[PDB]
Design a protein around this ligand. Structure first.
Ligand SMILES: Nc1ncnc2c1ncn2[C@@H]1O[C@H](COP(=O)(O)OP(=O)(O)OP(=O)(O)O)[C@@H](O)[C@H]1O
Ligand SMILES: [Ca+2]
Lengths: 354, 131
């Protein structure tokens, strides 16, 4: 049975083609002493380990550590002999061929997989939504991408990248949370802020009005009970965290907001298919999970684009695993048999085959 | 490229060819049932036109039923791209949703379009992350 691995900057999603969800989801972290630990086990012993993220902004930068992530994925997580399973791996859009070459070489030469295939994350997400044309807003832990896609293929010139995502958001919430008096500095407390971000944060339909409402009543305030018993209150930080997506300025980035990069990306594609991009904005990624993000994006984009144009945002309820699901469907198709790359063909052609 | 039998039979002669996605596979619909779609399934439609100038014309439509499962609508979408790739990309792709089919699509069926409850079952095995 084919395996499907979606190597994100923060979480690795892994499972079996045919399943509607990844069986394994763990941190993309490798820890080494003074001979290595991965994911939760790496975090358990963070005290005696130097922790590193092998994937930076969706791009693999540490091959020695990436190898440990894959070893842990196959053996510990899935409990399977790599040599008996065809493997589908995902990659960030505009990923350097050298990287795709290294990826392939490691799979075949160190894990001896019988066959493999590398798919672009944004395109798998679009397939999962039952579309061949549209534009994907892909937002995770380490990067956000705007990928317009026409008839199955990502339009190279129009792709946009924004190095701001979930981790940055967590960092910001932690920052404005202290200002409000509270304090989460240590590594152990940062997990608390992430839980607050995922449980209480949301996108305001209108930032200005929410700021007003919050300075007057306490109608927007939600309580968050700490483990030790304490109960801290969160008010405007709920929608100020996600606001950073539309206004990267909050964290000091002259960068354009996600509504802005979506519009610019659509604007760099043939005008004839623009009506289609506008009506097929698909969002995928943990960081697009905030409640109210569809409505905001819906309003922000019609403000930018000409009023006669019809805007439609598709925000799938499981968009956090959309990439993995699209690959699960892809690697299950009777046609996928031919598009693999076999170990045999690799032994002859080498890296230049992927 | 695909050795998949149906890809070899695609767009070889003027006409209409319909497939239904069934457990991650493209299965041809009996000719006599053309126009009858299971609202819980997904299909791929290929229309080939005779263009005098020895210029065969192709239009690929993937129809999504209101109760078709994610794995089906996804497969219909993917099959469409592979079939088009197979046909050298000469086909124009079209997403058709139940109830809102394009005027072009509806025209392929002289005696109207007819829906019907039911369908083949999802090829998706259910699981819950980290369990
Ligand atoms: N309900 C939620 N609300 C807000 N954020 C969430 C939610 N669930 C998960 N997240 C966040 O989304 C981010 C993760 O996504 P994903 O799993 O999409 O990232 P990756 O695949 O790890 O990273 P990348 O795409 O950058 O390579 C995390 O930083 C996490 O905090
Ligand atoms: Ca069905």
């Amino acid at each position: 049975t084919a395996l499907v691995c979606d190597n994100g900057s923060g979480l690795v999603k892994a499972g079996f083609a045919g399943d509607d969800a990844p069986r394994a989801v763990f941190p993309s972290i490798v820890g080494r002493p003074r001979d290595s630990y991965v994911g939760d086990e790496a975090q358990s012993k963070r005290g005696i380990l130097t922790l590193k993220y092998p994937i930076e902004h969706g791009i693999i930068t540490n091959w020695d550590d990436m190898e440990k992530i894959w070893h842990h994925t196959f053996y510990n997580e899935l409990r399977v002999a790599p040599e008996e399973h065809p493997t589908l791996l995902t990659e960030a859009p505009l990923n350097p061929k050298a990287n795709r070459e290294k990826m392939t070489q490691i799979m075949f030469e160190t894990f001896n997989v019988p066959a493999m295939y590398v798919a672009i994350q944004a395109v798998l997400s679009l397939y999962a939504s039952g579309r061949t044309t549209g534009i994907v807003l892909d937002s995770g832990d380490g990067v956000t991408h705007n990928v317009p896609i026409y008839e199955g293929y990502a339009l190279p010139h129009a792709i946009m990248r924004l190095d701001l995502a979930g981790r940055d958001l967590t960092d910001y919430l932690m920052k404005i949370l202290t200002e409000r008096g509270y304090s989460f500095v240590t590594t152990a407390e940062r997990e608390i802020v992430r839980d607050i971000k995922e449980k209480l944060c949301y996108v305001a339909l209108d930032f200005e009005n929410e700021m007003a409402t919050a300075a007057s009543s306490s109608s927007l305030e939600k309580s968050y009970e700490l483990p030790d018993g304490q109960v801290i209150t969160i008010g405007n930080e709920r929608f100020r965290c996600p606001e950073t997506l539309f206004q990267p300025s909050f964290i000091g980035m002259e960068s354009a907001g996600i509504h802005e990069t979506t519009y610019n990306s659509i604007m760099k594609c043939d005008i004839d298919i623009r009506k289609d991009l506008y009506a097929n904005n698909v969002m995928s990624g943990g960081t697009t999970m905030y409640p109210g993000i569809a409505d905001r994006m819906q309003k922000e984009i019609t403000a930018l684009a000409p009023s006669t144009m019809k805007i439609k945002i598709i925000a799938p309820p499981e968009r956090k695993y959309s990439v993995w699901i699209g690959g699960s469907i892809l690697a299950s198709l009777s046609t996928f048999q031919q598009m693999w790359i076999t170990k045999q063909e690799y032994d002859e052609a080498g890296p230049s085959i992927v | 490229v695909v050795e998949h039998p149906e890809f070899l039979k695609a767009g070889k002669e003027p006409g209409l060819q319909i497939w239904r996605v069934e457990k991650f596979d493209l299965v041809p619909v009996p000719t006599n049932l053309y126009g009858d779609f299971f609202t819980g399934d997904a299909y791929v439609i290929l229309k080939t036109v005779q263009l005098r100038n020895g210029n065969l014309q192709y239009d690929l439509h993937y129809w999504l039923g209101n109760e078709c499962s994610q794995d089906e609508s996804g497969a219909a979408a993917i099959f469409t791209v592979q079939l088009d790739d197979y046909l050298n990309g000469r086909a124009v792709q079209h997403r058709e949703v139940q109830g809102f089919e394009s005027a072009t699509f509806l025209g392929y069926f002289k005696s109207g379009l007819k829906y019907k409850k039911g369908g083949v079952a999802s090829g998706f095995k259910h699981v819950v992350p980290n369990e």
